[PDB]
C-alpha cells in the first residue's frame, strides 16, 4: 500500500552473508546463557 | 475493617426514618415474588399492606449492615431495633 | 468463579458407587417408576461401573489396599487398579513400567490372588 522503497533492496553478497552468521549465534549464546 | 461483635457496639439502637422505608420497601417485592409470609393474614391483597401489618409483630427475617465511614461493618438484627 | 486448587486429594471408586447410591435413594423411586436432565446423566454413571464390578462391605476392601502398596514411594497407582481387568497379569504388565525388571519375587504372584480374591 505504501510506495517508494529505500534504495537498499539487494541480493545478499558473500561479503556479508558470513557477517550475518555472527548475529544468530550471538543470540543463541546469550539467550541460552544465564538470563 | 471486619465484623464487629455485640460488645464494641457504639452507635444508635434506634430504627431510623430511612430504615422503615427500605425494609418495608424490599419486603413487598419478596411478597410479590411468592416468598411465603409468616403472619396470620386474613383475606388481604396489595403486597405492601401485608408487609406493614407483618412489621407490627416484628417477624422480619432480615438484618441491617450499617457501614462506618472507614469501611467497617456494624450489624443490627431487625428485631433488636425499636420504633 | 474462582478455582482455588484442582488436585487436593483422591477418592476411591467405591464412593463413586456409595455416595451415588444415596443419591439414588432420595430421588423419587429411581429406575422402577416405569409402571430433570440431571437424573439421566447420574444414572448413566452408576450402571456403567457396576457392570464392570459384576461382570459388599467397605472394610474387606480396606485391608487388601494395605497389603498392595508395598512400594518405596512410587505407590500412587494402587488407586487406579481396583476394577481394571481382574485376574490378569499381562494386563498388569502394561499398566506400570519398569516392574518386569523389579518384581522378580513372590510378590507379583501374591498380588494376583488378592485381585482374583477381589473377584
Amino acid at each position: 500500500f505504501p510506495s517508494i522503497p529505500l534504495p537498499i533492496n539487494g541480493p545478499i553478497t558473500n561479503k556479508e552473508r558470513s557477517l550475518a552468521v555472527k548475529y544468530i549465534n550471538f543470540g543463541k549464546t546469550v539467550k541460552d546463557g544465564p538470563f | 475493617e471486619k465484623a464487629i461483635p455485640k460488645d464494641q457496639r457504639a452507635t444508635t439502637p434506634y430504627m431510623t426514618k430511612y430504615e422503615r422505608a427500605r425494609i418495608l420497601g424490599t419486603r413487598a417485592l419478596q411478597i410479590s415474588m411468592n416468598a411465603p409470609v409468616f403472619v396470620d393474614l386474613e383475606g388481604e391483597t396489595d403486597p405492601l399492606r401485608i408487609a406493614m401489618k407483618e412489621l407490627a409483630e416484628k417477624k422480619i427475617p432480615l438484618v441491617i449492615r450499617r457501614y462506618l465511614p472507614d469501611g467497617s461493618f456494624e450489624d443490627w438484627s431487625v428485631e433488636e431495633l425499636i420504633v | 468463579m474462582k478455582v482455588l486448587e484442582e488436585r487436593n486429594a483422591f477418592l476411591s471408586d467405591y464412593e463413586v458407587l456409595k455416595f451415588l447410591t444415596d443419591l439414588e435413594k432420595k430421588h423419587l423411586w429411581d429406575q422402577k417408576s416405569l409402571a430433570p436432565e440431571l437424573q439421566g446423566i447420574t444414572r448413566n454413571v452408576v450402571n456403567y461401573l457396576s457392570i464392570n464390578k459384576n461382570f459388599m462391605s467397605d472394610e474387606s476392601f480396606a485391608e487388601l489396599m494395605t497389603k498392595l502398596n508395598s512400594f518405596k514411594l512410587f505407590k500412587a497407582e494402587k488407586l487406579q487398579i481396583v476394577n481394571q481387568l481382574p485376574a490378569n497379569m499381562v494386563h498388569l504388565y502394561s499398566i506400570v513400567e519398569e516392574c518386569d525388571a523389579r518384581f522378580d519375587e513372590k510378590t507379583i504372584e501374591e498380588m494376583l490372588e488378592i485381585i482374583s480374591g477381589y473377584a
Binding site: - | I23, I64, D75 | A9, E15
Partner: protein
C-alpha cells in the same frame, strides 16, 4: 473548609470540587471536558449529580446502608464427607 473563602461561581466551583461530570452539568460544559482528557484526569462516581446520569444506586439518604439476609445456619452441619482417602 479549604483554607480560603471562595464564591459559588465558575471560579469558585473549580476550587471546591473536581469531578468532571458534575462540572460539565454546570454552566460552561465543554471547557471542563477537553482539558480533563488533556490532563487525563480520573474521578470516581460518588457525588449525587453523576450517579443520576450513570443511573446507579445513590450513595446517600436511604442509599447508605445495605440489606442483608439471615442464613439460619452454623458450623454444626458444615463438616465434610471425608472417608477413605488413600489407606
Amino acid at each position: 473548609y479549604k483554607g480560603e473563602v471562595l464564591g459559588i461561581t465558575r471560579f469558585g466551583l473549580s476550587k471546591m470540587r473536581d469531578s468532571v461530570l458534575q462540572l460539565a452539568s454546570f454552566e460552561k460544559t465543554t471547557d471542563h471536558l477537553f482539558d480533563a482528557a488533556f490532563y487525563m484526569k480520573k474521578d470516581a462516581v460518588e457525588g449525587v449529580s453523576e450517579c443520576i446520569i450513570l443511573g446507579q444506586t445513590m450513595s446517600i439518604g436511604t442509599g447508605s446502608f445495605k440489606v442483608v439476609k439471615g442464613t439460619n445456619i452454623s458450623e454444626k452441619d458444615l463438616v465434610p464427607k471425608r472417608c477413605l482417602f488413600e489407606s
